[PDB]
Amino acid sequence: GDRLRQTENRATRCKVERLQLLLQQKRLRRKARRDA
Amino acid sequence: PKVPDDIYKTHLENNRFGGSGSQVDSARMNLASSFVNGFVNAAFGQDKLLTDDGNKWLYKNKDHGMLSAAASLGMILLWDVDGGLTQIDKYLYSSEDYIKSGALLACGIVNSGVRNECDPALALLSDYVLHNSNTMRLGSIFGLGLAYAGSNREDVLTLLLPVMGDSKSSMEVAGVTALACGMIAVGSCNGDVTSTILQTIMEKSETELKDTYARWLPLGLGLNHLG
């Protein structure tokens, strides 16, 4: 119950962090392409 | 941003019962306010109720009203996948299953209508598809369906389909999964989706089919075969 919820919260945190990183990379790549 | 009061314009109306007026369901009216705020501020990204202090407004609601109010945030942040997560994360980890399900649906809504290579909707909502909480199942299924409506994504479809046949799935979850599959495979005549829906319909009893939530399975098949 509580342990499962904590594990799910950690997994979602990690996934969100990875997603934000990937999106920042995508945004900067798009900006670089537009500048080019 | 426009708050619901601006739309309501109560002061114009003749305030005959400005004192001890009719006692309406305050929770229901708060839910109506949340829906109105979402609709009025849809796609703009700024809101004067959830953004300034969202926890207060959310806890103002009751039961599922919290789920709908949380999804309203994604409705507001529509088409802003990049900014959707940085705002919905606060509510993605909440002590209330209703709020977490609403955050899942909000992410799905935010991704709806736009396509990224990061597949944020899948990445976030593939975890809670089979979770033991039916409310979270509902939120995740509907979010995925709205995020990938009209896409015909085989990975998402194969992820979603077992939910219909899963034992620990209420009629509500079964119907919502049928709806999500229909939206994902609209105008595709998917053999997998049609076979799964037909098997699910046949597997149930007359008493179970008397439920109104079961009306969402034929709707799923029709959406699959639309046009």
Swiss-Prot record, chain A:
What's written under domain?
Answer: Contains three domains that function in concert to promote proteasomal degradation of bound substrates. Contains a ubiquitin-like domain (Ubl) toward its N-terminus that is necessary to promote substrate degradation. In the middle, two domains termed Catch1 and Catch2 are necessary and sufficient to interact with unstructured regions within substrates. The long C-terminal region associates with the proteasome.
What part of the full protein is here? 377 to 412 of 468
The record's note on quaternary structure and interaction partners says:
Interacts with GCK; the interaction occurs preferentially at low glucose levels. Interacts with the proteasome.
Report the protein name in the record. Midnolin
Explain the purpose of this protein: Facilitates the ubiquitin-independent proteasomal degradation of stimulus-induced transcription factors such as FOSB, EGR1, NR4A1, and IRF4 to the proteasome for degradation. Promotes also the degradation of other substrates such as CBX4. Plays a role in inhibiting the activity of glucokinase GCK and both glucose-induced and basal insulin secretion.
Name its cellular compartments.
Nucleus, Nucleolus; Nucleus; Cytoplasm, Cytosol
Gene designation: MIDN
Swiss-Prot record, chain B:
- Describe tissue expression: Found in skeletal muscle, liver, heart, brain, kidney, pancreas, lung and placenta.
Q: Which residues carry this modification: N6-acetyllysine?
A: K210
In this chain, where does the modification Phosphoserine occur? S20, S22
Q: Where are the PC repeats?
A: 68-101, 102-138, 139-173, 176-210
- The organism's superkingdom is given as Eukaryota
State the family it belongs to: Belongs to the proteasome subunit S2 family.
Q: How does it assemble?
A: Component of the 19S proteasome regulatory particle complex. The 26S proteasome consists of a 20S core particle (CP) and two 19S regulatory subunits (RP). The regulatory particle is made of a lid composed of 9 subunits, a base containing 6 ATPases and few additional components including PSMD2. Interacts with RPGRIP1L. Interacts with CRY1 in a KDM8-dependent manner.
Query: What is the purpose of this protein?
Result: Component of the 26S proteasome, a multiprotein complex involved in the ATP-dependent degradation of ubiquitinated proteins. This complex plays a key role in the maintenance of protein homeostasis by removing misfolded or damaged proteins, which could impair cellular functions, and by removing proteins whose functions are no longer required. Therefore, the proteasome participates in numerous cellular processes, including cell cycle progression, apoptosis, or DNA damage repair.
Q: What name appears for this protein in its UniProt entry?
A: 26S proteasome non-ATPase regulatory subunit 2
Naturally occurring in which organism (per UniProt): Homo sapiens (Human)
Q: According to the entry, what is the taxonomic lineage of the organism?
A: Eukaryota, Metazoa, Chordata, Craniata, Vertebrata
